Amino acid sequence: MKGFEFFDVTADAGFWAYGHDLEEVFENAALAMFEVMTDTSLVEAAEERRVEITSEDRVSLLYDWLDELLFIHDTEFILFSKFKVKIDEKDDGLHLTGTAMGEEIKEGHERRDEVKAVTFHMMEILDEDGLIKARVILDL
């Protein structure tokens, strides 16, 4: 039911996300960081944002999906964020569309884990029994 599992790394920390339709794993990846970076369990959704991505290797979509979250995070460091993803196979490549809601940072934001950056932590998507799983490790 969780669909997410994290391992204990020294310096970095990577979480495992599960899918359901490919798009499921990608958006689930963002929750891994947020769930530990803060406590969204309190904020509903005051704002909404959409992101677009172009991939051509599936596995890379994850590497570029979360990395995209890294930049926007500071562009709007918010306590809570919903994850929705859209994957469309282009005339040959791949496209990723994700939505985020709940933007409103407070003076005393709830911080849990501390990540200095995301360095090719794993960003690998493994499929088991037809299910997709993603791996994202974060820098100390």
The ordered H/E elements are: EEHEHEEEE
**Could you say how many structural domains there are in total?**
1
**Quaternary assembly:** monomer
CATH superfamily: Archease domain
Q: How far apart lie the N and C ends? A: 28 Å
Please tell me the CATH architecture by its name.
3-Layer(bab) Sandwich
The tally of helices reads 2
Q: Strand content of the residues, in percent? A: 25-35%
> Helical residue percent?
10-25%
Choose one word for the global shape: globular
Secondary structure class reads alpha+beta
Main CATH class: Alpha Beta
Widest sheet, order of strands: 1-2-7-6
Radius of gyration: 14 Å
Largest sheet: number of strands, sense, barrel closure: 4 strands, antiparallel
- What fold name stands as the CATH topology? Archease, Possible Chaperone, Chain: A, domain 1
Q: Count the strands?
A: 7
List the helices and strands and how they pair.
Blueprint: E1 4-6, E2 12-18, H1 23-37, E3 48-55, H2 59-75, E4 84-89, E5 94-101, E6 124-128, E7 131-139
Helix pairs in contact: 1-2
Keywords for this structure?
Archease_dom, globular, alpha+beta, metal-binding, Archease, Possible Chaperone, Chain: A, domain 1, 140 residues, Archease_arc, four-stranded antiparallel sheet, Protein archease
